[PDB]
Every structure is written in C-alpha cells, then in structure tokens.
CSV table of C-alpha atoms and ligand atoms in Angstrom, one decimal:
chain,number,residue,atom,x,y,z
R,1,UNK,CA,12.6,0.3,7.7
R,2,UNK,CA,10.5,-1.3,4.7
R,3,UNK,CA,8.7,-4.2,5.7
R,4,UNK,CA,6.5,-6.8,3.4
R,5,UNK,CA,2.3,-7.3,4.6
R,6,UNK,CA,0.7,-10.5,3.2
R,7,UNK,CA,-2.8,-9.7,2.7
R,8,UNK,CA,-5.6,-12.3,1.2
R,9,UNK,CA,-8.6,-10.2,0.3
R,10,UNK,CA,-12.0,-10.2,2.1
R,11,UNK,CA,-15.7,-9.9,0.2
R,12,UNK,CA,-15.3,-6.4,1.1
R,13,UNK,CA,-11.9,-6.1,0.1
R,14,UNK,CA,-8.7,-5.7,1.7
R,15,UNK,CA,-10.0,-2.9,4.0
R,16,UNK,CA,-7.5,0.1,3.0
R,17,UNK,CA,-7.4,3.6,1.2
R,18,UNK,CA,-4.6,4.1,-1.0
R,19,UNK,CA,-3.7,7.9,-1.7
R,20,UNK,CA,-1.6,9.3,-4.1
R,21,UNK,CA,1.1,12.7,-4.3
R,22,UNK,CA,1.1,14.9,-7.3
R,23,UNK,CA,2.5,12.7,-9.9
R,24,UNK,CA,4.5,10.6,-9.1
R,25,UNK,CA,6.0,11.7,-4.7
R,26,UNK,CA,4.2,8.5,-4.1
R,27,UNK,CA,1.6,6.3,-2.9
R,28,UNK,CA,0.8,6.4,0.6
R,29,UNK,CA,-2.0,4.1,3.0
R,30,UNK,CA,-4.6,6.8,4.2
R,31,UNK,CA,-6.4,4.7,6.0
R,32,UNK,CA,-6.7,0.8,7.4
R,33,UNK,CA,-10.0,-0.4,7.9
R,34,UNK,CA,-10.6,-1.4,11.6
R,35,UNK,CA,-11.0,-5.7,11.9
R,36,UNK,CA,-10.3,-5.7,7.9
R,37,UNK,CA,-7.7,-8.2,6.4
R,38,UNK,CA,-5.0,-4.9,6.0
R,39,UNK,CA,-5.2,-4.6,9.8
R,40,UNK,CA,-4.8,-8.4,10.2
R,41,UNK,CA,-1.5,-7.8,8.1
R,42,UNK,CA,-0.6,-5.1,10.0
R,43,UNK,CA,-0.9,-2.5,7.6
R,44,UNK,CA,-0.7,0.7,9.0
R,45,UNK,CA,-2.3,4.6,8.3
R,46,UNK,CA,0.6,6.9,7.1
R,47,UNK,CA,2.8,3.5,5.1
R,48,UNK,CA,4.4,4.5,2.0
R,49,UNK,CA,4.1,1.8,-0.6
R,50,UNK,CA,7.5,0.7,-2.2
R,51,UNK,CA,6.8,-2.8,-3.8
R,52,UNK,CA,3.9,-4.9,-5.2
R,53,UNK,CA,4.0,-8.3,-5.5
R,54,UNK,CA,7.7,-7.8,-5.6
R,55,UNK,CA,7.9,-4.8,-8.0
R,56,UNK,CA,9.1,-1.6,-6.8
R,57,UNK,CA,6.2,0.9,-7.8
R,58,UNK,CA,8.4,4.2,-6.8
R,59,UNK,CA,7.7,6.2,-9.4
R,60,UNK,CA,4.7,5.2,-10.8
R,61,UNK,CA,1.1,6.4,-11.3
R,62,UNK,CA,-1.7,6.0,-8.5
R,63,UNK,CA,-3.5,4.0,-11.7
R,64,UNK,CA,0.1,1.6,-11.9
R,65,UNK,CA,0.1,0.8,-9.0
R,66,UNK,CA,-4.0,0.2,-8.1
R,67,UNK,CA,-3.9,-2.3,-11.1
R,68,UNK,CA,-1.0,-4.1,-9.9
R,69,UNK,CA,-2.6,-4.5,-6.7
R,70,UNK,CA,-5.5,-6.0,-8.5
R,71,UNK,CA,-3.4,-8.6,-10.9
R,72,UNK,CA,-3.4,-11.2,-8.7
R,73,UNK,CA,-6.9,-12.2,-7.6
R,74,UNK,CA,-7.4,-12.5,-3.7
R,75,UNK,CA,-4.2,-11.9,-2.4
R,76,UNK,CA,-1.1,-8.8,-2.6
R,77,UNK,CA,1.7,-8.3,-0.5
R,78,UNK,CA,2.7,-4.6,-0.2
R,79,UNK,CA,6.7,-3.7,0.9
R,80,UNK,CA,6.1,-0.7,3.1
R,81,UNK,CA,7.5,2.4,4.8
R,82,UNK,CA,6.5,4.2,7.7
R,83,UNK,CA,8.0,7.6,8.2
R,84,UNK,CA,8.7,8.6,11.8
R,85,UNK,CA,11.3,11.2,10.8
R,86,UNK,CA,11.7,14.4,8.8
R,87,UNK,CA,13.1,17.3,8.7
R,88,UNK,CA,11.9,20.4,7.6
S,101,LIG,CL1,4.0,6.6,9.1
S,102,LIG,CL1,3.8,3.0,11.2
C-alpha cells in the first residue's frame, strides 16, 4: 500500500532515477542509488510515485512532477507504491 519517504537531499542529490510512462501512466523510481539519501529513506526500484510534498501528481507530466520535487530546497517526501501484483 502507498507509503510516505522523507528524504533530505545530499551534495550529489537525493540518489534516485525517476522514469516516466507515455503521457501521463505515471512516474515510476527506476533506480535508488546504493548508500544515497533515497536508500536511507527506503526508497525502493520499481515505486510508483503518487504524492509530492503532499500533492497527488497522478496525472501529471514527468516535467510537473521533477519541478515539484525541486520546490523545496534540500528536502521532498514522496507517497509511494510498489506493485507486487498484476494481472495480465
Ligand atoms: Cl515494485
Ligand atoms: Cl517495493
């Protein structure tokens, strides 16, 4: 079920890869950079992002949803999703 990661930005960043779905399925966490401060927050590879900084974000662009990641300077907290479950 969703679940809310408190992350506080590093000099390198916050250490993930966000990846988006032909406009607009989504915006899913590629990738978590090993000993970075998305790991620390236990950000995991595969998350769909639902919320930043309290905003749901379903819906809109990979560009929306980078910049309101970067509105508040050093810190984010991302409501996420893992999907364990589909059917095809
Ligand atoms: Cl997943
Ligand atoms: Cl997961």
């Amino acid at each position: 079920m969703p679940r809310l990661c408190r992350l506080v930005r590093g000099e390198q960043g916050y250490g993930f890869h966000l990846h988006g779905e032909k406009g607009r399925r989504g915006q899913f966490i590629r990738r978590v950079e090993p000993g970075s401060p998305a790991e620390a927050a236990a950000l995991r590879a595969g998350d769909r992002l639902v919320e930043v900084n309290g905003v749901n974000v379903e819906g809109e662009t990979h560009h929306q949803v980078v910049q309101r990641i970067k509105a508040v300077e050093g810190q984010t907290r991302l409501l996420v999703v893992d999907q364990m479950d589909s059917t095809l």
